[PDB]
Amino acid sequence: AYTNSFTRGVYYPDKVFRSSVLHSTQDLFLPFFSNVTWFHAIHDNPVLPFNDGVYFASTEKSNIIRGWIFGTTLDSKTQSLLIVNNATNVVIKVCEFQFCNDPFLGVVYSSANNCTFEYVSQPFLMDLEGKQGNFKNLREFVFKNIDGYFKIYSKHTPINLVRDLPQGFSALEPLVDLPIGINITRFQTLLALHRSYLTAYYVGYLQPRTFLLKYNENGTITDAVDCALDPLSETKCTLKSFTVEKGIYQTSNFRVQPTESIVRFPNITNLCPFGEVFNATRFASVYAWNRKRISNCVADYSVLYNSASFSTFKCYGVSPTKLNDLCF
Amino acid sequence: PLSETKCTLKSFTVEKGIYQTSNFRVQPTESIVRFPNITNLCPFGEVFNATRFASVYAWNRKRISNCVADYSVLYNSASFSTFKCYGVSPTKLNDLCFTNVYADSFVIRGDEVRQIAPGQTGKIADYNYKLPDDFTGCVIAWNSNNLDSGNYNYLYRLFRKSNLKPFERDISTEIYQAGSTPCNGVEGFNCYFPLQSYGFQPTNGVGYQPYRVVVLSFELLHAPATVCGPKKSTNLVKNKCVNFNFNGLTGTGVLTESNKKFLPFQQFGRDIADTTDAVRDPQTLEILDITPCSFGGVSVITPGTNTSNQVAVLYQGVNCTEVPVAINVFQTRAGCLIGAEHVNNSYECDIPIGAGICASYQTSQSIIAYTMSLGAENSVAYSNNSIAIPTNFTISVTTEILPVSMTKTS
Amino acid sequence: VDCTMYICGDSTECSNLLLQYGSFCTQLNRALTGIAVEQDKNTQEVFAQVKQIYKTPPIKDFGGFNFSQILPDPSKPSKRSFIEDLLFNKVKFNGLTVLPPLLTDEMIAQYTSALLAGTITSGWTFGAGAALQIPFAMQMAYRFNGIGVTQNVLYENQKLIANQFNSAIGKIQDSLSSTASALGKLQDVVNQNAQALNTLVKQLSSNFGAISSVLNDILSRLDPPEAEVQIDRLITGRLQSLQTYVTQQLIRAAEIRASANLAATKM
Amino acid sequence: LSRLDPPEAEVQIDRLITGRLQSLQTYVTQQLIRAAEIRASANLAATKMSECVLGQSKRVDFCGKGYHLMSFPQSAPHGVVFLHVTYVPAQEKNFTTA
Amino acid sequence: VDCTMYICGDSTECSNLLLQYGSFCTQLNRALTGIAVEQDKNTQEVFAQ
Amino acid sequence: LSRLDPPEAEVQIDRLITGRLQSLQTYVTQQLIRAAEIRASANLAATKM
Amino acid sequence: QVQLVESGGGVVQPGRSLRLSCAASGFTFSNYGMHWVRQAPGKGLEWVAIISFDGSNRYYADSVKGRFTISRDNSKNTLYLQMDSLRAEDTAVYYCAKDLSFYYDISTGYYPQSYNSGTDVWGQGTTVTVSS
Amino acid sequence: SYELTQPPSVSVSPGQTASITCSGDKLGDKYACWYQQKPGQSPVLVIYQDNKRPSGIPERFSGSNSGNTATLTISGTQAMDEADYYCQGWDRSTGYYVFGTGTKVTVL
Ligand SMILES: *[C@@H]1O[C@H](CO)[C@@H](O)[C@H](O)[C@H]1NC(C)=O
Ligand SMILES: *[C@@H]1O[C@H](CO)[C@@H](O)[C@H](O)[C@H]1NC(C)=O
Ligand SMILES: *[C@@H]1O[C@H](CO)[C@@H](O)[C@H](O)[C@H]1NC(C)=O
Ligand SMILES: *[C@@H]1O[C@H](CO)[C@@H](O)[C@H](O)[C@H]1NC(C)=O
Ligand SMILES: *[C@@H]1O[C@H](CO)[C@@H](O)[C@H](O)[C@H]1NC(C)=O
Ligand SMILES: *[C@@H]1O[C@H](CO)[C@@H](O)[C@H](O)[C@H]1NC(C)=O
Ligand SMILES: *[C@@H]1O[C@H](CO)[C@@H](O)[C@H](O)[C@H]1NC(C)=O
Ligand SMILES: *[C@@H]1O[C@H](CO)[C@@H](O)[C@H](O)[C@H]1NC(C)=O
Ligand SMILES: *[C@@H]1O[C@H](CO)[C@@H](O)[C@H](O)[C@H]1NC(C)=O
Ligand SMILES: *[C@@H]1O[C@H](CO)[C@@H](O)[C@H](O)[C@H]1NC(C)=O
Ligand SMILES: *[C@@H]1O[C@H](CO)[C@@H](O)[C@H](O)[C@H]1NC(C)=O
Ligand SMILES: *[C@@H]1O[C@H](CO)[C@@H](O)[C@H](O)[C@H]1NC(C)=O
Ligand SMILES: *[C@@H]1O[C@H](CO)[C@@H](O)[C@H](O)[C@H]1NC(C)=O
Ligand SMILES: *[C@@H]1O[C@H](CO)[C@@H](O)[C@H](O)[C@H]1NC(C)=O
Ligand SMILES: *[C@@H]1O[C@H](CO)[C@@H](O)[C@H](O)[C@H]1NC(C)=O
C-alpha cells in the first residue's frame, strides 16, 4: 500500500541547543508530504533498501517490532549490524552475521562469527501500548549512515488515527550515535513470533533537503518548512520566516540543464610515437637535451602513468589522470 | 587620559570636544579547565608495538574511545622518525578532547611513506590508502628493518580501476584488465594480478627497508568528546570574567547559572547569531550561560588644552561597579562619566555626552555634567482678542557658508 | 563597531597580524563615528529650530479649532501628545555598540511642542523673530489670504472650517490607530539597520577557507607559523565584510541626511 | 625584488598589490561618497545664488532667519559665503484686535 | 546580477567553495534589488502626480 | 577543472572567486552611488513637475 | 558493589534547617535520576523528592514542596536534600534510592526515551527527628 | 490528593497463595512497582512494570495491573515472606511517584 507522510521524519540535526530562532539546516530529511510504503508484515517482512537513510514508523498494538537488521549482503560475507531489543536489554552488535532467510525473534537471534562490535544496554523498545488502552503509540525512527556513524533518532507519541500517519508535527530526538563505519545498503525488520515457523509499519527514505527549523523559547522544534516542497515554502525559506507579507520575492534561479554530452574530435587515427621517446637506445647528454615535437597524434597517457617503470611521475600545470581527456 | 587623547589625534593641542581614545575591556581573573571524568588511560601501546602490522591494502582499524590520551609521550619518544600532523600541532594535542580517534596501522615499502598525506598522488596514495585532502590528524612512521625484514608476507596493490575514496579499503583480488581487450581467469596479454609482495630482504638499502606506519585521525566537538587529553580539570567559578576550557571549547567570558533547559543530548547552546552562549559543564552536567564580560569604548571629555588640562573620562555603555577592575562618578545612560561633577542646573549643550546629558567647563573651576536645556522658557501671552504688532525693526546680515567644490586629486 | 574586536577579540596573536594591514580599522571607526555624529546633527537641524520653548496658554479658545490630539498630554510621564503616542507605538555581539541619541525622545517631543505652541499662538511670526501673538481666527484668515481667498470666506463660515479641521484630525487619529501601516518609511530604516547588523554578525561564522570560523579553535589547535596562514584568511574575510558594512552604511547615512535636510526644509 | 628572485618574489609582491589595491579602492570609494556630499552642497549653493542673490525669497529660513531682503555672495576657498540681509521686527506692543 | 552564475556559473565545485565566503551573494543581490525597485519608485514619483 | 584535480584545482579556483567577488562588489558599490545620484535627480524632477 | 550511604541525620528543633547527604559509588551516578524517600516511625513509605540526571527537573511531594530542596553534584557522586522550616511530621528515616533505569548514558550518548519504573538500589537510611 | 489504598494487613498460611492488592483511581494508566521491607531494613524492589522481577528475586513473585487496581501475588509463601509490601504509582511524565499505604503480610 502507500500513505502520506505529511510532516513526519524531522529530527534534531545536531547536539546544539537553540531557542527562539529559525535555523536553516541542510541534512538528510524526509521530504514533506512524501509517499511512505505501508507494509502489512502480518496477515511478511521484505528486505528493503537503505538508500541514504530510512524513516521507519509503526503503530502496532502489542510491540511486535523488536528491532532491525542492517547490512549489504546479509549472508556472513560482509559485516552487518543487528539491533534486537529483548525483554530486558537491547543488543547492538556488528558481526559477520549468517542471517536466516526469514529473521524473527522467538518467545534467541544472534551470532559471533568474526565479530567487531557489541553494546548491550537498556532497551528503547518496550510494550507501552497497554497503558494507553485504545490510543496507540506511534513509534517513529530515523536511521542514517554518514561519516562512519550509524545515527538513530526516535520519538513515541499517543495517537488514535488508524489508517494513516498523524496530521501533526513532532521532532525526533537521537537515540544512539554509533561509531560503526560499515557499508549499509539493505535492511529488514525482525518480529516477535510465538509460533516459530522457520520458513504494520511505514518506511520512507531520506533525501538531501534544506529545512528551516523553528525553535521555540523552550528550545524544541515546533514547526518546520521544507524549502524545496513548493514555491511558497521556498519563499518562506529565502526570507528566513514562516509568514510572508504581500509582494513579489525572488527565491531562486531557473536554469535549463543540458540533456546530453557531445564530443567532437578531429578524425585522427594514428597512434602517437611515445615509444620512440622512452625506448630510445641512447639518451642525449643533458647539455644537448633532445627536442622532439609531437603533432597529429592520438596520445594515450594512461599507459605512461600506470607503468611501474617510472620512479618519478609529477605533473605541474596538468593532473596526471586528466591528461587523456585534455586536447593539447 | 589627556596624553592618550593627544596621541590618538597625533597632535599636541586638542580642541574642545569628546574624543574616543581607546577601548575598555574587563580582563580574565583566572583560568578554568573542565574535562570529562574519564576513568582510564589509553591503549596506544597496543597499536605502536603490535607483534604484526597489516598490509597496506588491508590496513588495520582501531577505534579509540574513553581515553585519557597523553600524546606527549608519543612525541617525546625518539623511535618515530616521521611525526607530522596536518590539522593540529603535535605539541598541542594534549589540551584538546576529540571523538572517535581512529588509529590505522600498516607497513610501507620505505621512502614512499611521503605519499601518506593529503593530496598526494602515487601507487600507495591512489590505490592502497587514501586520506582526505582536509585531513586532520597525525601520520606516524618509523623504520622497522629489524622487525619486518627476508620476508614476503607484506603486500600492496599495483592496480585499481579507479582512485580510492578517502579511508577506503579494497580486499578484492580479481584480475585487472589493463589492456583494451577482455581478460579472464589468468594474467593474459596486458593483464595482471593486482597485488604482489614488497620483498623486504635485509639487503635492501635505505629508503626501501620496511617502514611501519601508524596514522591517527581525529574528530572534535561533533559529539560528547571521548578521547580527552591529559589536562587536569580545575574548579568552577561563576560571576567573574574568566577564560575557560570545556572539552576543548576555549573562550573568555563570565559564567552564570542558566535557566536554559538543555535536552539530555545537547552539550552546547547558541544565540540567534550562532555564537556560543551556553555550555553544559562536563563534570556536573549543569548548564552555564556564557556572557562576554564587559567591554566598551573610552571617551575623553576635554576642553581646549588652551583653557585647561583637566579632562573627564566616559566609559561608554559600561556600569561604574566594574570599571576600576581595569584602571567624581556619575552614572549616565551612555556610561560612567568619571571626573565630572553632576550639577542640577541645566545649561545649553557644550560637549554632548549623550542621552540628553552634556558636559562643560564652568566655575573653583572644573568639568560639570548636566541635562542640556533646550531653550529659554516662554509663555506667549495668547488671547482671543490681543495682537502684538512690532513698532520698529532691525536689519540683520547673517553670513552663511557652504562648500562648493573639493580638491581635484588624481 | 570596533574593528579590532569584531575581526578578532581576546587574541593578541590575531591583533598583531591585523596591524600589518595598516590603518584600515582606524578608517572604519572614523567613518562610523562620523555617521553617528551626523545622526545627531540631522535631529538637531530638523527639530531645534525654535530659540525658545513656547507654551500653549492654559485656556485654549482657538476659535473652535481643537488641537487636543496634537498638543502635549501632561497626564503621562513624557511630553508626547496623543498622535505622538500612536506614532511611537506603531513603529554585546563581538564589537557592536549602539550609542544613545543626544536628544532623548522627551526632548524631541518638547521641541515639537514648542513648535506647535508657537505656530498656534503666533502663526509664522515666531519663525521670523519674536513670537507675536494673534488670535487663531485672524491667523487662519491671513492664511486664507495667502492662497488667494479673501478673509471673509473664513469669518462668515468659521464654524464649518473649525468642524472640518477637527474631523480631519480625528480621521488622522483613527487612521494611525487602525491596522494601516502608514509609517513604513521609518520601519524600513529600522529594518535596514537591523538587517545590516545581522548580516555583519552572521558573517563572523564564515570561515573564508580557514580550517574553522572560530579563532579559539585555530589558536588552540595550531602552532603560530601554521595558525598565521589561517588567521590571515579570517582577517581578510572579516575585514572585507566590515568594509562592505561601513560602505553601505555610509551610503545609507547619505540618503538619510538627504531626508533629514528635506525634513528640516519642510519644517 | 633585490632580496628575492621571481619564483617566490611574486608571492610576496602579490601581498602588496592586493593590499595597496584594496587601500586604493577604499580611497576612491570614500571620495565618491564625499563628492556626492559636496555635489549636494553645490546644488544648494547654486539654489541659494539663484533664489537669494538673483531675487528675493519667500521661503522661510532659506535665505537667513527673518524676512529676506537680499543676499550678497562672497567667494571663499572651496566654497561660497552668502551675506543674507534680513528684516526682523522688534519692539512689540500689545493691542486689542477685532 | 546572479552572484553564483556570474562568478562561477554551472560548476558545483566552485558553488561549494563560494559558501565559505558566507552571504556575500545575498547582500549583493539585495542591493541591486533595492536599486531596481528604487528606479520604479523614481519614475512613479516623477510622472504619476 | 579539466586540467587539475580537486586538491590543487581548489587553490586556483579560490583566486578566481576572490577576483570576481571583488569585481562584483565594486560594480554594486558604483551602482549604489550612481543610484543615489539618479535618486537625487529624480527627486529634483518630481519637485520641478 | 552498587551501594548508597546517607549521612547528616540528627536531632533538630522545629523551624530550623538540616541537610542530608547521600554518597553513591559503584555506578555512574550522573546517569541515573535519584529519589528521596522517608518513613515515619511505624508508618509506611512516603516519597519526598526526585531529581533528574542533570538536575534540570525536580519534583517534590505536597507535604514538603516549598520547604525542602533537592540537589546533586555529579562531580562528587553525592545527592543533597536541603530542608528548611522543619516540623514535627518530618520525623522519619530518610532513604536515597537509585532508579533502576538510567535517563541518559553520558559515556556513549545512549538516550533510551523509554524507561523501566523500578528503583533497584536503596540506601541504608539516616534518622531525622523534629521536636522541641 | 492521591491515596493509593491497600488493606492494612493480609493473613496467609505458609505454602498458601497471598494476593496483595493496591488500588488507585487512575492506577491503570500508570505503572506499578512493589517493594519488600523486612523490619529494620531498607525496601527491596520486587516488581516493576507491573509484572517484571529484577534479577535475583525469586520467580514465585508476580503482579498485575488493570483498571483501578494493581495486585501483587506470591505463588507459594515461605516463612521469610513476612514483611511490609508497598505499592508505588510511577509516571515519569507527570512527575508522579507516590507510595502506597503499605500492607503487612501475616504468616501464621
Ligand atoms: C505519491 O504521492 C502523491 C501525492 O500524495 C499521490 O498523488 C500519488 O498517488 C502517490 N504515489 C504513490 C506511488 O503512491
Ligand atoms: C537479553 O540479551 C542479553 C545479552 O547478553 C542477555 O544476557 C539477556 O539474558 C537477554 N535477556 C533475555 C530476556 O533473555
Ligand atoms: C572468519 O573469517 C575467516 C575467513 O573467511 C574464516 O576462515 C573464519 O572461519 C571466520 N571466523 C571464524 C573464527 O569462524
Ligand atoms: C556498498 O555495497 C554495495 C553493494 O555491494 C555497493 O554497490 C556499494 O558500492 C558499496 N559502497 C561502498 C561505500 O563500498
Ligand atoms: C517552557 O518551560 C516553562 C517552565 O517549565 C513552562 O512554563 C512553559 O509552559 C514551557 N513552554 C511551553 C511552550 O510549554
Ligand atoms: C573519418 O572519416 C571516414 C571516411 O574517410 C569515416 O568512415 C569515419 O567514420 C570517420 N571517423 C569518425 C571519427 O567518424
Ligand atoms: C616501450 O616498450 C614497452 C614494451 O616493451 C611499452 O610498454 C612502452 O609503452 C614503450 N615506450 C613507452 C612509450 O614507454
Ligand atoms: C614500544 O616499546 C619501546 C621500548 O623502548 C618504546 O620506545 C615505545 O614507547 C613503545 N611503544 C609504545 C608503548 O607506544
Ligand atoms: C586661548 O585662550 C586665551 C586666554 O583665554 C585667549 O585669549 C585666546 O583667544 C584663546 N585662543 C583660542 C584658540 O581660543
Ligand atoms: C549598575 O549595576 C548596579 C549593580 O549594583 C545596578 O544596581 C545598577 O542598576 C546598574 N546600573 C545600570 C545603569 O545598569
Ligand atoms: C541635585 O538635586 C538632588 C535632588 O534634589 C540632590 O539629591 C542632589 O544632591 C543635588 N545635587 C547637587 C550637586 O546639588
Ligand atoms: C528703531 O530702532 C533703532 C535701533 O535699531 C533706533 O535707533 C531707533 O530710534 C528706533 N526707532 C523707534 C521708532 O523706536
Ligand atoms: C476638544 O477640546 C476639549 C478641551 O481640550 C477636549 O476635552 C476634547 O476631548 C476635544 N475633542 C477632540 C475633538 O479631541
Ligand atoms: C504684552 O503682554 C505681555 C504679558 O506677559 C508682557 O510681558 C509684555 O511686556 C507686553 N508688551 C509687549 C512688549 O509686547
Ligand atoms: C572525578 O572522579 C573522582 C573519583 O574517581 C572524584 O574523586 C573527583 O572528585 C571527580 N572530579 C574531578 C574533577 O576530578
Coordinates of N, CA and C in Angstrom, one line a residue, chain C residues 60-161:
Chain C
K60 N -7.7 77.6 26.1 CA -7.4 77.3 24.7 C -8.5 77.7 23.8
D61 N -9.0 78.9 23.9 CA -10.0 79.5 23.0 C -9.4 79.8 21.6
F62 N -9.2 78.8 20.8 CA -8.6 79.0 19.5 C -9.7 79.1 18.4
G63 N -10.8 79.7 18.7 CA -11.8 79.9 17.7 C -12.6 78.7 17.2
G64 N -12.6 77.7 18.0 CA -13.3 76.4 17.7 C -12.4 75.3 17.2
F65 N -11.1 75.7 16.8 CA -10.2 74.6 16.3 C -9.7 73.8 17.5
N66 N -9.8 72.5 17.5 CA -9.4 71.6 18.6 C -8.1 71.0 18.3
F67 N -7.1 71.2 19.1 CA -5.7 70.7 18.9 C -5.3 69.7 20.0
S68 N -6.3 69.2 20.7 CA -6.0 68.3 21.9 C -5.3 67.1 21.4
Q69 N -5.5 66.6 20.2 CA -4.8 65.4 19.7 C -3.3 65.6 19.4
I70 N -2.9 66.9 19.3 CA -1.5 67.2 18.9 C -0.8 67.9 20.0
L71 N -1.4 68.7 20.9 CA -0.8 69.3 22.0 C -0.4 68.3 23.0
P72 N 0.6 68.6 23.8 CA 1.2 67.5 24.7 C 0.2 67.1 25.8
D73 N 0.3 65.8 26.2 CA -0.6 65.3 27.2 C 0.2 65.3 28.5
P74 N -0.1 66.2 29.5 CA 0.6 66.2 30.7 C 0.2 65.1 31.7
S75 N -0.7 64.2 31.3 CA -1.1 63.1 32.2 C -0.2 61.9 32.1
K76 N 0.8 61.9 31.3 CA 1.7 60.8 31.1 C 3.2 61.2 31.4
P77 N 4.1 60.3 31.7 CA 5.4 60.6 32.0 C 6.2 61.4 31.0
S78 N 5.8 61.3 29.7 CA 6.5 62.0 28.6 C 5.7 63.2 28.2
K79 N 6.3 64.0 27.3 CA 5.7 65.2 26.7 C 4.8 64.8 25.5
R80 N 4.8 63.5 25.2 CA 4.1 63.1 23.9 C 2.6 63.5 23.9
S81 N 2.2 63.9 22.8 CA 0.7 64.1 22.6 C 0.1 62.7 22.3
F82 N -1.2 62.8 21.9 CA -1.9 61.5 21.7 C -1.4 60.9 20.3
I83 N -1.4 61.7 19.3 CA -0.9 61.2 18.0 C 0.5 60.8 18.0
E84 N 1.3 61.5 18.8 CA 2.7 61.1 19.0 C 2.8 59.8 19.7
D85 N 1.9 59.6 20.7 CA 1.8 58.3 21.4 C 1.5 57.2 20.4
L86 N 0.5 57.4 19.5 CA 0.2 56.4 18.5 C 1.4 56.1 17.6
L87 N 2.1 57.2 17.2 CA 3.2 57.0 16.3 C 4.4 56.2 16.9
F88 N 4.7 56.5 18.2 CA 5.7 55.8 18.9 C 5.4 54.4 19.1
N89 N 4.1 54.0 19.1 CA 3.8 52.6 19.3 C 3.7 51.8 17.9
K90 N 3.3 52.5 16.8 CA 3.2 51.8 15.6 C 4.5 51.3 15.0
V91 N 5.6 52.1 15.2 CA 6.9 51.7 14.7 C 7.5 50.6 15.6
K92 N 26.6 43.9 22.4 CA 27.4 42.8 23.0 C 27.4 41.7 22.0
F93 N 27.8 41.9 20.7 CA 27.8 40.9 19.6 C 29.2 40.9 19.0
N94 N 30.2 40.8 19.8 CA 31.6 40.8 19.3 C 31.9 42.2 18.6
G95 N 31.9 43.2 19.4 CA 32.4 44.6 19.0 C 31.3 45.6 18.8
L96 N 30.1 45.2 18.5 CA 29.0 46.2 18.2 C 28.7 47.0 19.4
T97 N 28.2 48.3 19.2 CA 27.9 49.2 20.3 C 26.9 50.2 19.8
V98 N 25.7 50.3 20.3 CA 24.7 51.3 19.9 C 24.7 52.5 20.8
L99 N 25.2 53.6 20.3 CA 25.3 54.8 21.1 C 23.9 55.4 21.3
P100 N 23.6 56.1 22.4 CA 22.3 56.7 22.6 C 22.2 58.0 21.8
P101 N 21.0 58.4 21.4 CA 20.9 59.7 20.8 C 21.1 60.8 21.8
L102 N 21.7 62.0 21.3 CA 21.9 63.1 22.1 C 20.6 63.7 22.7
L103 N 19.6 63.9 21.8 CA 18.3 64.3 22.3 C 17.4 63.2 22.6
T104 N 17.0 63.0 23.8 CA 16.1 61.9 24.2 C 14.7 62.2 23.5
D105 N 13.9 61.2 23.5 CA 12.6 61.3 22.9 C 11.7 62.4 23.6
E106 N 12.0 62.5 24.9 CA 11.3 63.6 25.7 C 11.7 65.0 25.2
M107 N 13.0 65.2 24.9 CA 13.5 66.5 24.4 C 12.9 66.7 23.0
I108 N 12.9 65.7 22.1 CA 12.3 65.9 20.8 C 10.8 66.2 20.8
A109 N 10.1 65.6 21.7 CA 8.7 65.9 22.0 C 8.5 67.3 22.5
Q110 N 9.4 67.8 23.4 CA 9.4 69.1 23.8 C 9.6 70.1 22.7
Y111 N 10.6 69.8 21.8 CA 10.8 70.7 20.7 C 9.6 70.8 19.8
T112 N 8.9 69.6 19.5 CA 7.7 69.7 18.7 C 6.6 70.4 19.4
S113 N 6.5 70.3 20.7 CA 5.5 71.0 21.5 C 5.8 72.5 21.4
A114 N 7.1 73.0 21.5 CA 7.4 74.4 21.3 C 7.0 74.9 19.9
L115 N 7.3 74.1 18.9 CA 6.9 74.5 17.5 C 5.4 74.5 17.4
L116 N 4.6 73.6 18.0 CA 3.2 73.6 17.9 C 2.6 74.8 18.6
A117 N 3.1 75.1 19.8 CA 2.6 76.3 20.6 C 2.9 77.6 19.9
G118 N 4.1 77.7 19.3 CA 4.4 78.9 18.6 C 3.6 79.1 17.3
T119 N 3.4 78.0 16.6 CA 2.5 78.1 15.4 C 1.1 78.4 15.7
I120 N 0.6 77.8 16.8 CA -0.8 78.1 17.1 C -1.0 79.5 17.7
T121 N -0.2 79.9 18.6 CA -0.4 81.2 19.3 C 0.2 82.4 18.6
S122 N 1.0 82.2 17.6 CA 1.7 83.3 16.9 C 1.8 83.2 15.4
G123 N 1.3 82.1 14.8 CA 1.4 82.0 13.4 C 2.8 81.8 12.9
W124 N 3.2 82.5 11.9 CA 4.5 82.4 11.3 C 5.5 83.4 11.9
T125 N 5.0 84.3 12.8 CA 5.9 85.4 13.3 C 7.0 84.9 14.2
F126 N 6.8 83.7 14.9 CA 7.9 83.2 15.7 C 9.1 82.7 14.9
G127 N 8.9 82.4 13.7 CA 10.0 81.9 12.8 C 10.8 83.1 12.3
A128 N 10.1 84.3 12.2 CA 10.8 85.5 11.7 C 11.5 86.2 12.8
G129 N 11.1 86.1 14.0 CA 11.7 86.8 15.1 C 11.0 86.5 16.5
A130 N 10.7 87.5 17.2 CA 9.9 87.3 18.5 C 8.5 86.9 18.1
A131 N 7.9 86.0 19.0 CA 6.6 85.4 18.7 C 5.6 86.5 19.0
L132 N 4.9 86.9 17.9 CA 3.8 87.9 18.0 C 2.5 87.2 18.1
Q133 N 1.9 87.3 19.3 CA 0.6 86.6 19.5 C -0.5 87.2 18.6
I134 N -1.4 86.3 18.2 CA -2.5 86.7 17.3 C -3.6 85.7 17.5
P135 N -4.9 86.1 17.6 CA -6.0 85.1 17.7 C -6.0 84.2 16.5
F136 N -6.3 82.9 16.8 CA -6.1 81.9 15.7 C -7.1 82.1 14.6
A137 N -8.3 82.7 14.9 CA -9.2 83.1 13.8 C -8.6 84.0 12.8
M138 N -7.9 85.1 13.3 CA -7.3 86.0 12.4 C -6.0 85.4 11.7
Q139 N -5.3 84.5 12.4 CA -4.2 83.9 11.8 C -4.7 83.0 10.6
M140 N -5.8 82.3 10.8 CA -6.3 81.5 9.7 C -6.9 82.4 8.6
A141 N -7.4 83.5 8.9 CA -7.9 84.4 7.9 C -6.8 84.9 7.0
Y142 N -5.7 85.3 7.7 CA -4.5 85.8 6.9 C -3.7 84.6 6.2
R143 N -4.0 83.4 6.7 CA -3.5 82.2 5.9 C -4.4 81.9 4.7
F144 N -5.7 82.3 4.8 CA -6.5 82.2 3.6 C -6.1 83.3 2.6
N145 N -5.7 84.5 3.1 CA -5.2 85.5 2.2 C -4.0 85.0 1.4
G146 N -3.2 84.1 2.0 CA -2.0 83.6 1.3 C -2.3 82.7 0.1
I147 N -3.5 82.1 0.1 CA -3.9 81.2 -1.0 C -4.9 81.9 -2.0
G148 N -5.1 83.2 -1.9 CA -5.9 83.9 -2.8 C -7.4 84.0 -2.4
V149 N -7.8 83.6 -1.2 CA -9.1 83.6 -0.8 C -9.3 84.7 0.3
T150 N -10.3 85.5 0.1 CA -10.5 86.7 1.0 C -10.7 86.3 2.4
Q151 N -10.6 87.2 3.3 CA -10.7 86.9 4.8 C -12.1 86.4 5.1
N152 N -13.1 87.1 4.6 CA -14.5 86.8 5.0 C -14.9 85.4 4.7
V153 N -14.2 84.7 3.7 CA -14.5 83.3 3.5 C -14.3 82.5 4.7
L154 N -13.5 82.9 5.7 CA -13.3 82.2 6.9 C -14.4 82.7 7.9
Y155 N -14.4 84.0 8.2 CA -15.2 84.5 9.3 C -16.7 84.2 9.1
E156 N -17.2 84.4 7.8 CA -18.6 84.1 7.6 C -19.0 82.7 7.8
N157 N -18.0 81.7 7.7 CA -18.3 80.3 7.9 C -17.1 79.7 8.7
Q158 N -16.7 80.4 9.8 CA -15.6 79.9 10.6 C -16.0 78.6 11.3
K159 N -17.2 78.4 11.7 CA -17.6 77.2 12.4 C -17.5 76.0 11.5
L160 N -17.9 76.1 10.3 CA -17.7 75.0 9.3 C -16.3 74.6 9.2
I161 N -15.4 75.6 9.0 CA -14.0 75.3 8.8 C -13.4 74.6 10.1

